[PDB]
Amino acid sequence: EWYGPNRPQFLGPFSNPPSYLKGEFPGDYGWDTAGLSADPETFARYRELEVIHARWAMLGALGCVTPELLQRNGEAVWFKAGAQIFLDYLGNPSIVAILLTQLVLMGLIEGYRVNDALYPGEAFDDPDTFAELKVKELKNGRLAMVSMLGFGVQGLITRKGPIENLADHL
Amino acid sequence: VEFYGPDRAKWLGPFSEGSVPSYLKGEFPGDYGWDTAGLSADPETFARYREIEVIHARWAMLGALGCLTPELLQNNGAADFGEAAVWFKAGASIFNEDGLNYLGNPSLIHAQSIVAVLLTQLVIMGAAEAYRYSGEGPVETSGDSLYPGGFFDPLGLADDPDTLAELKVKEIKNGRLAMFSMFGFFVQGLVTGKSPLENLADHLAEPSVNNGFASATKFLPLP
Amino acid sequence: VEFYGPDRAKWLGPFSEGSVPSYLKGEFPGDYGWDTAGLSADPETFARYREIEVIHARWAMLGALGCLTPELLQAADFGEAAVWFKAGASIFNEDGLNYLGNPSLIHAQSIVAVLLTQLVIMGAAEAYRYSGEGPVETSGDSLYPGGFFDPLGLADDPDTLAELKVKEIKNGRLAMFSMFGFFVQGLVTGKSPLENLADHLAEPSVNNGFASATKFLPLP
Amino acid sequence: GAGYRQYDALWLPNTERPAWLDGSLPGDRGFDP
Amino acid sequence: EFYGPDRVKFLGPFSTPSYLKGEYPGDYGWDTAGLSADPETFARYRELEVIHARWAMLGALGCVTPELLQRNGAANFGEAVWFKAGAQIFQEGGLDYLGNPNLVHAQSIVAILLTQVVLMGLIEGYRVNGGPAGEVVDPIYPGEAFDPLGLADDPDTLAELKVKEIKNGRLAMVSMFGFFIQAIVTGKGPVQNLSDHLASPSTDNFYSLYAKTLA
Numbered sequence: 001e002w003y004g005p006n007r008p009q010f011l012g013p014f015s016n017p018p019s020y021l022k023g024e025f026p027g028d029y030g031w032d033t034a035g036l037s038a039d040p041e042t043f044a045r046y047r048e049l050e051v052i053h054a055r056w057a058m059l060g061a062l063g064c065v066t067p068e069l070l071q072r073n074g075e076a077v078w079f080k081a082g083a084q085i086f087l088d089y090l091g092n093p094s095i096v097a098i099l100l101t102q103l104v105l106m107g108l109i110e111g112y113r114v115n116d117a118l119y120p121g122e123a124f125d126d127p128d129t130f131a132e133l134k135v136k137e138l139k140n141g142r143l144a145m146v147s148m149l150g151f152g153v154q155g156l157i158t159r160k161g162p163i164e165n166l167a168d169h170l
Numbered sequence: 171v172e173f174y175g176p177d178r179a180k181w182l183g184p185f186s187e188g189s190v191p192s193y194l195k196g197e198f199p200g201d202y203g204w205d206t207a208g209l210s211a212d213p214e215t216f217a218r219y220r221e222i223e224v225i226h227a228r229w230a231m232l233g234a235l236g237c238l239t240p241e242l243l244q245n246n247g248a249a250d251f252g253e254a255a256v257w258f259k260a261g262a263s264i265f266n267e268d269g270l271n272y273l274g275n276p277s278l279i280h281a282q283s284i285v286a287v288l289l290t291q292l293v294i295m296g297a298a299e300a301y302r303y304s305g306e307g308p309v310e311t312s313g314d315s316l317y318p319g320g321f322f323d324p325l326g327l328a329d330d331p332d333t334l335a336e337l338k339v340k341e342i343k344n345g346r347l348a349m350f351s352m353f354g355f356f357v358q359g360l361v362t363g364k365s366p367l368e369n370l371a372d373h374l375a376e377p378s379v380n381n382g383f384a385s386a387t388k389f390l391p392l393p
Numbered sequence: 394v395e396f397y398g399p400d401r402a403k404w405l406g407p408f409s410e411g412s413v414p415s416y417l418k419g420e421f422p423g424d425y426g427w428d429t430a431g432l433s434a435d436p437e438t439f440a441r442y443r444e445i446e447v448i449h450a451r452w453a454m455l456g457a458l459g460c461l462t463p464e465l466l467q468a469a470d471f472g473e474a475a476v477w478f479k480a481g482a483s484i485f486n487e488d489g490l491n492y493l494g495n496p497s498l499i500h501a502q503s504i505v506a507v508l509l510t511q512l513v514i515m516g517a518a519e520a521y522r523y524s525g526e527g528p529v530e531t532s533g534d535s536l537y538p539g540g541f542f543d544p545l546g547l548a549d550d551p552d553t554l555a556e557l558k559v560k561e562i563k564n565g566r567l568a569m570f571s572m573f574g575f576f577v578q579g580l581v582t583g584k585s586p587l588e589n590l591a592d593h594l595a596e597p598s599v600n601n602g603f604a605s606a607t608k609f610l611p612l613p
Numbered sequence: 614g615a616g617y618r619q620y621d622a623l624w625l626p627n628t629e630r631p632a633w634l635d636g637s638l639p640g641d642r643g644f645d646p
Numbered sequence: 647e648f649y650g651p652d653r654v655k656f657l658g659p660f661s662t663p664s665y666l667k668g669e670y671p672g673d674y675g676w677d678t679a680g681l682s683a684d685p686e687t688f689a690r691y692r693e694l695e696v697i698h699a700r701w702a703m704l705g706a707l708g709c710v711t712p713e714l715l716q717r718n719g720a721a722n723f724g725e726a727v728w729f730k731a732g733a734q735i736f737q738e739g740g741l742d743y744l745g746n747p748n749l750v751h752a753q754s755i756v757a758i759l760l761t762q763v764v765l766m767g768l769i770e771g772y773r774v775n776g777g778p779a780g781e782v783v784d785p786i787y788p789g790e791a792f793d794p795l796g797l798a799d800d801p802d803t804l805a806e807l808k809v810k811e812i813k814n815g816r817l818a819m820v821s822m823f824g825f826f827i828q829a830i831v832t833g834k835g836p837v838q839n840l841s842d843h844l845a846s847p848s849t850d851n852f853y854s855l856y857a858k859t860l861a
């Protein structure tokens with residue numbers, strides 16, 4: 001029910017989708033008010049960027065959530081993480097070396113990725129449930145982007161861990 | 171001074187012949203040929219940006235009077251707001267002991283909770299903006315998503331075609347001026363942290379002393 | 394770019410075409426069209442000069458390498474023998490020629506024996522080079538013998554061989570220039586080239602060649 | 614024919630000589646604004 | 647290389663949009679977000695890139711030169727540091743070029759601003775329309791009166807020089823961004839940072855004294 005004219009839009013009953021958002025790609029909720037994806041190539045690049053951002057935001061949200069929650073259950077804050085290296089894993093016993101190693105490994109893997117690119121499958125893994133999982137991935141990714149934006153803005157303005165702010169709400 | 175066609179006024183005067191893009195033919199109001207970054211090559215993008223620009227123009231045109239008029243009212247002794255006559259501290263009166271009241275009179279509004287007003291605004295926009303996106307509703311419009319007319323024109327000034335075109339041009343120009351002035355208000359509040367009328371009075375006192383370059387070393391990095 | 398034919402790179406850039414001699418047709422490696430004195434207008438003298446230039450360039454790269462390497466290895470200890478021109482009298486010292494610091498490798502004490510052995514061996518070598526034929530099988534070219542002196546087969550493709558010839562004449566010319574610089578620096582400042590480079594890098598504004606300019610002034 | 618550009622030279626890179634200055638006088642650069 | 651279909655890409659051997667056909671200078675095939683999928687927008691972006699490259703080259707040279715002169719004892723400027731050089735107009739005697747009181751002796755910022763606005767607007771209008779220095783044919787490569795030495799005469803040399811210009815301008819833009827963020831972080835001069843890092847590379851760097859204080 002997420003594909004075709006019966007798809008759920010971002011405004012609900014108000015059905016005014018753009019011409020180029022003809023409910024074909026996953027999550028086509030018909031939201032383009034600035035017309036930033038009129039060109040099909042621009043749409044393809046934007047889709048790839050959105051998916052990659054979704055996966056990275058998922059990983060970042062999980063990696064920011066885990067430390068402080070583990071601390072409460074037995075610096076822990078998400079943004080004060082790289083300051084410890086001036087770093088034993090889980091408290092269990094040179095920046096240049098790690099920098100070059102991470103850079104070279106990341107360059108290698110991303111060059112391999114560049115050379116379906118968006119959905120390779122195979123070594124990293126009914127088409128109906130496959131499309132359902134694609135839509136679910138896209139929604140979880142959008143939620144992750146919103147959560148990461150909120151987390152960053154709170155770190156800037158409150159200088160405290162996000163879960164600490166949640167506990168102080170509660 | 172034509173504002174339409176191939177012999178209109180451009181954005182660089184005499185030096186504007188070899189800068190007008192081929193897709194800006196001066197058909198729509200407010201056209202001056204200013205497109206150097208090529209952001210509206212696609213016609214759909216051009217239409218979307220036109221809509222965004224006119225809505226922004228209207229909103230800023232209202233916001234200019236919104237940020238100004240309380241200060242003029244308080245300056246003439248016709249009311250009393252305390253410190254809310256400025257634009258960037260009007261939202262702090264809702265947290266006051268007395269609260270926020272229209273015109274400073276306790277019998278007008280006397281609101282002291284921010285959740286209720288925020289919720290009412292949320293519903294109001296969620297209805298009205300969505301109706302604008304829909305393009306049709308319970309009111310009578312002339313079948314135009316940007317200039318509905320009819321119900322939205324109680325006095326019916328926009329009836330003649332040439333008069334309508336002139337009114338559109340005047341609207342878009344006053345909106346551009348209003349957006350420029352609102353950008354100025356924002357930066358001037360960010361930098362000097364004072365009332366815009368206070369800034370005008372200070373400049374009019376000593377034009378050569380109290381100007382923009384006076385607060386130049388304000389944002390200087392320190393070791 | 395190009396190093397052969399009428400469209401090769403030359404010695405004066407855009408101004409080269411006005412000073413290119415007729416006899417310099419770019420048929421040899423390292424041909425840049427630089428002959429303003431006409432010293433090679435005779436074909437035989439041109440061949441002799443090419444032979445002399447190539448031999449001198451080879452000896453120049455060898456000399457530059459042998460002047461640079463021992464100072465870096467000092468991994469060893471020599472003291473006053475680190476400098477290329479100060480290592481000549483290290484034989485006269487009553488310690489032997491301690492190769493790499495070990496006083497057991499060659500232990501050179503007398504200069505007459507080494508001098509005579511060098512004379513005889515290099516007389517034999519250079520006489521065979523002048524003859525060009527003997528116990529060693531070569532390709533027949535005096536300038537580029539090959540065969541035995543090419544035990545890796547890098548010179549098998551004629552175009553690759555020409556490119557290597559150009560490359561190596563250029564490297565030899567650079568080494569020639571650097572060796573002349575080494576000589577002049579040794580006469581002028583009396584310091585090792587590495588020390589000169591270190592002093593230049595310390596403060597290049599005042600530790601340049603013009604600082605030691607009045608030292609040669611003839612006083613009355 | 615190298616090391617420069619081949620390229621009447623007036624007082625401006627793109628300007629026209631006035632009608633009353635025909636370029637016959639010695640220092641005529643077409644300069645009379 | 648640098649042209650046609652076999653030129654060097656932006657990822658070396660690990661590397662392409664269909665509209666990047668290896669015709670224009672400085673094309674390494676790096677367009678991932680697809681902002682240049684329109685030929686007109688591509689032309690506009692190329693023109694802005696070239697203008698920005700030239701301006702950034704000029705800015706990098708003008709940010710390096712006065713402090714280098716001052717620190718070597720060659721001149722005594724009012725404010726050698728590039729981001730502090732704009733406050734010389736508020737000093738006692740005003741702005742003096744190279745420190746000489748008889749060179750410029752600028753005193754008023756209003757006059758400076760008015761003259762700069764007028765001259766820049768006039769020359770900008772000449773650039774986009776054509777004026778005393780020539781008539782516009784190529785919007786970014788006029789030549790003629792702007793190439794007196796005739797270095798861009800041969801088309802092959804012209805293409806090579808275009809590639810060199812665009813690459814040196816890209817490097818200048820990157821270094822200018824570095825200057826800005828260093829000034830906004832360290833608060834000292836660029837060559838001062840270079841000299842400090844050269845004095846003790848192991849201990850003097852961004853991480854050792856600024857990474858922890860950023861957050």
Ligand code: CHL
Nearest residue numbers: 179180181182183184185202204346350759763767768771
């Ligand atoms: C013949 C001369 C003439 C010139 C030179 C211009 C030039 C310009 N007009 Mg045009 N016009 C001219 C004639 C005419 N104009 C118009 C009608 C209009 C309109 C209606 C509009 C313009 C606008 C503009 C601007 C377009 C480019 C830009 O945004 O800013 C150019 C500026 C730069 C690229 C850089 C800024 C320079 C500045 C001096 C910086 C100085 C820096 C600070 C002192 C310190 C900075 C600190 C650091 C931290 C940042 C530009 C100022 C548009 C505009 O942008 O308005 C705001 C506008 O909307 N013009 C008419 C009526 C037909 C003209 C009559 O001949």
Ligand SMILES: CC1=C[C@H](O)CC(C)(C)[C@H]1/C=C/C(C)=C/C=C/C(C)=C/C=C/C=C(C)/C=C/C=C(C)/C=C/C1=C(C)C[C@H](O)CC1(C)C
Nearest residue numbers: 032033034035053056057059060063064078081145148149
């Ligand atoms: C749709 C549309 C349409 C129309 O047409 C127009 C418009 C409207 C404009 C549009 C919109 C848009 C939007 C809104 C967007 C957004 C975005 C985001 C937010 C993102 C994020 C995003 C985000 C992200 C990625 C994030 C990421 C993160 C990460 C990695 C992290 C990491 C980490 C970790 C692990 C942990 C530690 O401790 C730290 C670190 C190291 C740091």
Ligand SMILES: CC1=C[C@H](O)CC(C)(C)[C@H]1/C=C/C(C)=C/C=C/C(C)=C/C=C/C=C(C)/C=C/C=C(C)/C=C/C1=C(C)C[C@H](O)CC1(C)C
Nearest residue numbers: 204205206207208226229230233236237257260349352353
């Ligand atoms: C043309 C072109 C061309 C090329 O091609 C490219 C380029 C260059 C990019 C382009 C340009 C552009 C531009 C310039 C733009 C601008 C904009 C703006 C400024 C806006 C504003 C805008 C603005 C706006 C809306 C504003 C608004 C406002 C408002 C609402 C207000 C409100 C209020 C009030 C009443 C009062 C209170 O107490 C407060 C408040 C609550 C706050």
